[PDB]
Amino acid sequence: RVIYQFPDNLWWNEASNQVYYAQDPMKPERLIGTPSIMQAKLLKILCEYHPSPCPNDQIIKALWPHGFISSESLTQAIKRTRDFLNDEHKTLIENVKLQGYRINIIQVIV
DNA sequence: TCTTAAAATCGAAGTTAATATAAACTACATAACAGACATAAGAACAAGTTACAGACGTATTACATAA
């Protein structure tokens, strides 16, 4: 069981894959829900590289290894992924130009 | 009305390029010239302040796909 903490008391439980709000990681309070398989993919690419930024080419290759996909698809994926993780202030995942995207992780429980 | 000394005038252009002799010593004040210093003016570097450009990222809409 691997669980990741995000700012504003957010948690994501990967093994069962639930995003939620909870003061206690073992006791959820408000369940945001289940991210999609490609959404979990997106958080995977942002998560395996912390604290280093994940380059745009690497995430694009990983998400769609066999698809002719434009970078606009990656960017709208980030946007409509914020649509689900409710990061209105762009603080959960930071976009730094010509260097890629990052996700702010407070702690990891394994 | 008659001598007698002065006064004035005497062609244009053109060219032309000059000369050439004949007190010393001392005392003082002033001007000039040189060097060095201070000052004002400019050159160089670096920083700060500010808006705009350039491409990226985002947001929005419409087409396609899935139920």
The secondary structure of A42-94 as a DSSP string is: HHHHHHTTTTSPBPHHHHHHHH-TTS---HHHHHHHHHHHHHHHT-TTS-SEE
Cα–Cα distances in angstroms (integers) from residue A106 to residues A8, A27, A64, A96, in the given order: 10, 18, 28, 19
CB of A37 within 7 Å of some strand B atom: no
Q: Are A28 and A73 in contact (CB under 8 A)?
A: no
CB of A36 within 7 Å of some strand B atom: no
- Spatial separation of the C-alpha atoms in residues A8 and A103, rounded to whole Å: 13
A108-109 and A100-103 strand pairing: unpaired
Question: Following CA atoms A77, A26, A48, A64 in sequence, which dihedral angle do they give, to the nearest 10 degrees?
Answer: -30
Cα–Cα distances in angstroms (integers) from residue A7 to residues A43, A66, A96, A98, A99, in the given order: 15, 34, 18, 25, 22
Q: Are A105 and A57 in contact (CB under 8 A)?
A: no
Q: Which nucleotides of B are covered by protein (CB under 7 A)?
A: 56-60
**Angstrom distance, A110 CA to B35 C1':** 89
Q: Are A61 and A100 in contact (CB under 8 A)?
A: no
CB of A56 within 7 Å of some strand B atom: yes
- Spatial separation of the C-alpha atoms in residues A68 and A61, rounded to whole Å: 10
- Determination technique used: cryo-EM
Q: Are A2 and A108 in contact (CB under 8 A)?
A: yes
CB of A78 within 7 Å of some strand B atom: yes
Resolution of the coordinates, Å:
2.7
- Spatial separation of the C-alpha atoms in residues A73 and A78, rounded to whole Å: 9
